[model samples]
Target: GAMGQSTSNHLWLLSDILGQGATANVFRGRHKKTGDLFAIKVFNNISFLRPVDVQMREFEVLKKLNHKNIVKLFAIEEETTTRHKVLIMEFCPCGSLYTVLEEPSNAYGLPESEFLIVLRDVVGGMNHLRENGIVHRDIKPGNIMRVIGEDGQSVYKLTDFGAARELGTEEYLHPDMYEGATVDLWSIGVTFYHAATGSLPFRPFEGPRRNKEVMYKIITGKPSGAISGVQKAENGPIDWSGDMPVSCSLSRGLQVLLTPVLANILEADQEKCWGFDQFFAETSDILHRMVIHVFSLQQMTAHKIYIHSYNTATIFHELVYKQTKIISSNQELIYEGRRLVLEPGRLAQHFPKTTEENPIFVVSREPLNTIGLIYEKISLPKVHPRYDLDGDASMAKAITGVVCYACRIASTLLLYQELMRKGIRWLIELIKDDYNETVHKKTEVVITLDFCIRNIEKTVKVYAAELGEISDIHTKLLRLSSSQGTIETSLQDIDSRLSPGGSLADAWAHQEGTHPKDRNVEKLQVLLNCMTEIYYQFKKDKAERRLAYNEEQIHKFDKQKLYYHATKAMTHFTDECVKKYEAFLNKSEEWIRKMLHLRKQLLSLTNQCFDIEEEVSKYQEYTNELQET
Candidate 1:
């Protein structure tokens, strides 16, 4: 817990443990000086039977690796007393892709686009490694770390290089291997299959026997074995050629696209196994096409929702038109006795012709008392059969009151229907504008995402090539360091012999007085001094070369970091916009349905009154007749 600081008083301080492995413990660390965060990996110094120096090997490999998709190694420290080493690396707060797989949301497998993007990150990382003559033997979900960028987008990085074996340096420990590089490709294929299908390609095997089982499967197993089967008391094979067992969440298109890539990488014959170039050559175009399809599908989904909304709106609009006509006919019948009705669009003419202080200005400016005259015409009917006005003033008044109430109800209904028509018109324009804007936004996002992918691909490729160049320089530096170490060892031996307590100096002191010539002593001293000066000069040159190399790496790493931030931020922004538009489109459709339902109820009320016109006409005649008597 007290580790990670350069001198304990320096900035970096260890926090909670991020993870623990057999040989190392990873802890979260923070630097007080710069307020920076990192993950610190502390490795035990226990020796293994393998000739390769494992403790320093990871550091050497990591120190050379500099890429956005690959985890960044900041610095390393060795405790002199314990010989335990600590490595400071970039912190990925969002945890691993394995964690995501275990999550409830991703239990059924990730969305096709997301799965592909993550797969691409892994491939990108592997490609970088391949270009640099390194291979990640383990390429599972757990080794892929996801970090949340500033814009809240997930950026994946490849980690856990402890098991990584250099491609050219190490021979295959297993007989089934072709190249160390293909092993990485194999693991990548397995990861993709598991992530996309929500099941491992090979059955889980654990404990001490796990390695042998895995090796057996990798050497002989087909990808079809990983396909999940139907749940039963007894385990049974399921057909993968069909609908994907109802549990795989990958779309049909994605499954088809990934099929060849998976099968080729998982090929039992090591020679037949897909290489990096071969895999990309086959899948690159497919990946681009799939990406386009994914975005297009998102737009299509929104379009479908919009169409449903438009249909509902159209039905509501037609009902409003019929209701308005019906009310107008009723107005003709009423105002003749003594009543009126109000109306509220032009296609261009039915809608507002011009704007005023408010864009939503209404053309109608009728008084609120426009229907008051209709209320004044209320009268009671005196009849022997239908009505009994029998000389009771209160009863006549009640009949008159009922007639006035009917007139008031008709007036309000007309006003509301007119308002409803105007509202529908405004909504139509608003929805149309929004639909067009959403379409534009979707198109922009698709273009942006595609551009981001293209840039990312190019950047990674360039970084890989540049890495090769850097590796050349790195190799030169190592040689210089070796040369300097050899020279330093010789210098140390010579300096010790020339010293007073050393054998050469002691013998010289004992024989100095007995020797006839002191010139021999002087020559030996001169030779020793010259070699000492040469050693110091070589040491200074080595230091200068190391400093220059360090600076060069820092420069490269800085450029890569900037490139990563710029591209990732743009990508995340576009993705967020796409989601926002989708959500809005969905809500708009929901609103359309709810509005249609309400408008339909209002129209139905008016329609029912229209159907009962004959019965209403008789009442009007009776009232008129009573008023005349």
Candidate 2:
């Protein structure tokens, strides 16, 4: 390895500016070796007062943030000369969406096909942002980049990490102060509206004060016309009832699709704002169409198929080939024994009485008249004549009474076990899941108590060991106290003998005399006087020192302080008392047993096939509501 920094660090070469913002200027860059393009977002000192937030949060978010539609981050480095931090990201050569947004062709919004591309790509990018919990504060076309792929297809991406800031655009901010994913949705809608019409739906008035007035009026009301002041209400409360004005350039189809969409997202009220769920479903709905479940009666299986429309020729024989995978191009498909017709946009009439469970069948090789044999739809909930008068006048009322009575008895017996058991089986599972949480909490409480005991036991043991250290201190005090008292008494006696006005001083005074003897006595007196002055000074110093407290008091205080601490540890265990944990275990057993017993009761409810057989009143109750009017 080289012992110094590599030239690769210096290889990133900056070029012309690509985009500019309050926080950063995006410069186009190229690699020295590969000549690959890069977008360098060069920094400023004041873009964020806390530069770490941009470098940390954005780098982290954009680093892991990967999507086909989301702009990719490559590397980040500080410029060698200027020392400015720059974010090197994926560069798209086809310019940004705002380019398309500003075109004369888009003066009243992009054409339908062009607009769909923008809508799909932005939605994909925005939804990816939401999935990762990143909120793009600025979701305008300028933030979205366009790339002409190798296949020559148009692809748009979210290039800016608006996490850095919400700047310049106030209209994109939802009028409601409260926010969620809807914040980005509102912004996306405004950007879409602008892209669609080449104008902001609720644009501000000119100048600072007028602009503010426009913003507040919108925040309190609804979306209106373009920047023109004429569409705004002159007096009284603003009329917010009708659809906001649309560009004459937008076709009726596009206008109809987006009018209510813009209305929902551009509202000032949070409650009325369309969420991402509806917005994505509605937008994607325009692109994704009908899916049908076509049952193959020949194979007793089904296949799901998509349809452009219910047109007979449109669908024609291509469906049977899809299900059967055999060459039958001339076969006519049947639904409920009727020739499936070309009712172009009317899918409802094609399978008029079909259901989700028992849908319309494709009788490929089988005859339509014989469909009732294979398709079992003869369950009796409705009144259908079982038989007609095929010239049998021997019994009109007699045959009717016999058939109706048998049918009623059969339906009652059959559906009783099927419907109730199926529904209750699901109910029992629901009940189990419901009580499953209760049992889980019970286990958690015991486990939590066990953890408490484990921690408390360790704490108490540590405190006990600390208490032994406190006792050791007390023992040391006891050992030292014996010498302390004896030394105190002897020091007092010695001080009394050496005092200035005491016996030693009186003896020195008596010895004082004249001549050579007086000279010797005066020298000894100087020595005695020195000793007596030192004793009196030591006595006065000892008197001033003991005012706070004596040594014994400090010993007692040390023991008492540890006493309070030790008792605090004592409170934790005593507060719980004994055997309550075992008692909880006992209750747990009882609850489980009770749950078992109740489950048995629910299981036992599957009694006889017919409970009404034993009860006469139950049979009598059905007679009142049985007859059809």
Candidate 3:
């Protein structure tokens, strides 16, 4: 595992250089025996300062800090003859957070959810370091490496420990001599300011004058109201709308949650700065607000579905009324023996009475009589004098009326199918989404569909059953009319007997016995007239019943079928909601548990840091006494 303290012996060098640190140039390398990848930090031998010792210190710190969020040390090797040191550590393929920010693809701020996860990871790692009495002096985006977790999520780890030191060490002394957890907190504030706004809060160190001012601010807190000129507007107030991407601006409720937390973290007064517990508390409030927002959105969606369901029920009522009216009209015709009385003027309205330059009318009526008589003249064909004329005309008009009504019923059925189809489509859209906000919306949709199912199921069955009743009445009325007999049949028999050159016709023409011939002609004429009146009445009754029967069939075959289809769609919608509810509830519960678990981790880490701070203070006091002696 040691590779005999030599860089070339057991490591394969890759052409790609990862990065250059203050003390070393890092290269990508692979372990020869295990074939595992590693980041090899080779310290430059030319430096007169403590360059090799810095690399040695980094290796020691990483080995001790062995937390998941902190980088790992695989091996440390050195060229014994040249005194060149190489530190081998775990490889992070995704590169550093600084690279992530610089990439064009991430020009916009990271999505809030993803950024929060990154924030938490860094906090966790920092807590572990504090517990181990280690201070990561360079807490910038460049010092944090991104690696993929086992769950395929991006996990951030703190790296670049060259600038790291323990408390009370001579190397840790600043010009003004600062020490302890406050140093890391101040560095974190600077790092966070850069990450949040995509720019530095202060200029880079240029010498004593500039560095002095920056160091003063770090030592003593700056009020947020007084700070300005760091990618802000000309005014003293923080310019929330400039330089940074739009998404970086605090959202409506986020200011309250994040403002105090960030303010205390960036506070120059070390005593005033927040501990981990306070930071975690503020984050908890933010999480609570997020959950509340989602809950309200769900409620709004439920209300929307509630309105739609109410409207659907209203439509159902209207449809039922129309269906009932249609049945009622048909029933009147069947039971009351309603006559089809045609007014000549109104009849001519559907087909014109006289020839005119009306092309629309001419084309429209062409189908009824292909002979073109309807178009040629607007007059009715004269009834033949001897062939029961009344019965013939009345029966023809009655048959025409029934046919037209049947066609109208067919059109109604077409519309019914289309209307129901649209209703089903609306339900489909309501069922499609599964986003967090859509949870309550889906619940509303389910409840609405459930209501629809019951209403539609009952309505369809009632309508169908009512139609069957009407059909029953229609059949009975038809049979009753048939038993009484039709006068049209009797009129045909008389017309054949009295035709020219037949027995009755001959008896009338050759009258040798004047009294006998006259008596037979008189009797035949009276009988023919009587039969004509009866046949006219029968034609009228039959026409009315037939029209009613056609309407009943329309409701039975067309309207009722539409209701059944609508019911099925509702039923299916309800079933889909039930399935989604089962799965969503399980997922929602898991998500809530995860949030709680995060809070628990934060509390535990906070307690550990508090204990570490107490221990570090005692250690510092003992060293101070030793220096005094």
Candidate 4:
């Protein structure tokens, strides 16, 4: 029940065994003096469990890994009495992913929103591991630990290295022929399959008697099957037409969204399997896309739609039409018994309990009210009229600068309100009860969104003119594109004559003698006279025309490329900055905790020195009374 370890004078009493693995039993441990909890892993047998120096190599590797989504190892200690090795790791009280799926509510599958979070969290953890050149041989739900964040949300991480987490590691391993990373991908497919559908990707048609052979799905099942990979008897034909079993919790939206992804990772052939980068990109993209289900009021038949990037009246209206072939012009989409103006993620945020089975309704209601929410909060300024018809939009560039300012202001407001509540608490708590440890090492300085507000504002200001210049290229290129249209329109003038009904064809109808039904000299004279004139004139601007044509074609496509990249860059920039900002805030929190604690200590001592302060404070009343007298 209790295991003990020590470092020189200090001790840790590992009181309760929390995790039982193949070679090690993990215990809930406490600092003998400080009352801090840690997971202490004690090997069943020390050297007989492993070769010499293996634990040392593992400790070195573990210490080098520092990621938010990876479990943190605190210290390596040995039992004082028994001299057994112990791994003191960050203890996760929330438990493992496997147990969560085991609950009755999640028996069939996870709810859509919960499933999204799991995908995102695991994707992040795996990406961090890949970047560091590490492949976790056993990647499954049991190895994934969940931590409750400060916001009452769950943060899932990869932990429990090696094959200890699996009941038997065979079900999680990839089939024949692949890199260790491919092995990692296969396990993820199985794990995620369990997450979304709440069951293993493979199952024996018979029983656990042949459960060990579940890897055959990898050797043989098609991507769309319930078991996913190909399945076969010891010698029956491959089951290609297989389908996933019914998952009551799985929604229409997730069914569509997650299907293609599962197909990519759970492939019968390695050549057809998706790379980790593809998985990373696809999952991350899906996180931003929100799903909402809608059904016809009459038929009661439902369909789910993904609302991404654009959030406006027109897109939602068009999307419904595209999906159901029924115009929603006379009807409106209903949410909670009221008409809900649909947008991307925002609308999804307000509808927490919505799923495929529970859908928003399209009702035929009149008075339509014509309008409800003002979809346009702040619209970007239009290009100046004079520049609209011809030439580069210099005014358009300035317009973007204004637009950028508007966006910056928008981001700052929410961030400012958040910092107002949280930031002041840091200062208050540090000073609270006279503020409060030394861990051995110092982390790098962490400045955050609120702390860098002034700096970021100045940053946007400096880039304002630069953004103006950046967008100008697009506006100017677009103008040249229009110019190309005009140039082509004029060029079309020269082709009409040589075109099938061209006057040249009619004029040459007579034979070379220029007479009808004879050698055409009449038609020949006119054709011959005009053909050379046209060629000489055409030759006049031959090089310039060729060059202009080339320039316009290239320039026409430049704006297209520019628009695509600019939008994508902003998306990534927002995510990157937001990510770094959160981590930065976390870093500053630790630093401030220490600094504030010290300040309170100093403040308390300053009052003590006024053992002097007490004297002065007491004398203050005496002096005031004397002055009054």
The per-prediction tally of clashing pairs is 7, 1, 2, 19
For residues 581-620, could you state the per-residue lDDT of candidate 3 as single tens digits? Answer: 3343334334223323433443443344344334334332
Reference-based TM-score, model 1 = 0.41
Clashing pairs in 3: 221-268, 353-378
TM-score of each prediction: 0.41, 0.43, 0.40, 0.49
lDDT by residue (471-565, candidate 2, tens digit) is 54344434433433443344344345334553323222122211232232233333333333332333333434432345435433433332333
Q: After superposition, how far is residue 584 of candidate 1 from its true place, in Å?
A: 23
Residue runs of model 4 more than 4 Å from their true location after superposition: 1-15, 48-58, 162-168, 177-180, 210-244, 291-295, 301-304, 311-360, 364-629
**lDDT of the structure predicted as candidate 2:** 0.48
Q: Runs in model 2 with CA error above 4 Å? A: 1-15, 46-58, 162-168, 177-179, 204-211, 223-251, 290-629
Q: What is the C-alpha RMSD of each candidate to the true structure, in Å?
A: 43.6, 46.7, 42.7, 37.0
Which candidate gets the maximum TM-score versus the true structure? 4
Residue range 239-329, candidate 4, lDDT tens digits: 4423344533454455666777776776556677788898888888778877766654322234567767445556666666665555657
True-structure lDDT of candidate 3: 0.42
lDDT of each: 0.45, 0.48, 0.42, 0.52
Native-vs-model 4 lDDT?
0.52
Look at candidate 3 and tell me the lDDT of residue 97: 82
